[PDB]
Amino acid sequence: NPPPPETSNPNKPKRQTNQLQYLLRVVLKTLWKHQFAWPFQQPVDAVKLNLPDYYKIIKTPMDMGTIKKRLENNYYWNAQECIQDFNTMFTNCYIYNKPGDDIVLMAEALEKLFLQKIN
Numbered sequence: 001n002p003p004p005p006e007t008s009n010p011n012k013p014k015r016q017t018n019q020l021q022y023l024l025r026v027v028l029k030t031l032w033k034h035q036f037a038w039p040f041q042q043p044v045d046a047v048k049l050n051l052p053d054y055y056k057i058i059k060t061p062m063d064m065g066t067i068k069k070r071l072e073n074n075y076y077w078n079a080q081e082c083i084q085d086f087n088t089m090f091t092n093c094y095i096y097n098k099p100g101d102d103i104v105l106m107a108e109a110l111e112k113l114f115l116q117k118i119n
């Protein structure tokens with residue numbers, strides 16, 4: 001497995017904005033507490049899950065645990081930067097998995113809620 005994505009970086013300027021605070025306290029929190037959140041709460045462990053090809057296919061991994069920690073650490077400059085992480089997480093799931101698989105249907109339901117919350 002690759003190292004998980006960074007959640008802080010001393011060279012990367014930090015920032016707080018109203019939108020980023022909304023992303024943490026409304027958007028992320030509602031997705032995090034949803035029953036379908038669990039496969040998305042930690043970086044994919046391709047070794048433990050016997051998914052040897054996961055990081056062969058997925059070169060920009062992302063998960064809500066990393067997003068949560070980024071938000072809490074003020075890692076992002078702006079909301080768009082965080083939005084991009086969410087979108088990467090969902091697109092990865094759709095690229096890697098079969099349509100029809102539970103995990104895809106779960107991600108689709110989270111993404112629907114996400115889009116409702118950031119409209």
Ligand SMILES: COc1ccc(NC(=O)c2ccc(NC3=C(C)C(=O)CC3)c(Cl)c2)cc1
Pocket residue numbers: 038039040041042043044045049092093096097103
């Ligand atoms: C304490 O016991 C346990 C604690 C945690 C787990 N976790 C899992 O089974 C698990 C299952 C699916 C996951 N996500 C995946 C995504 C987003 C993919 O696209 C493929 C798999 C993740 Cl990251 C973890 C098991 C036992």
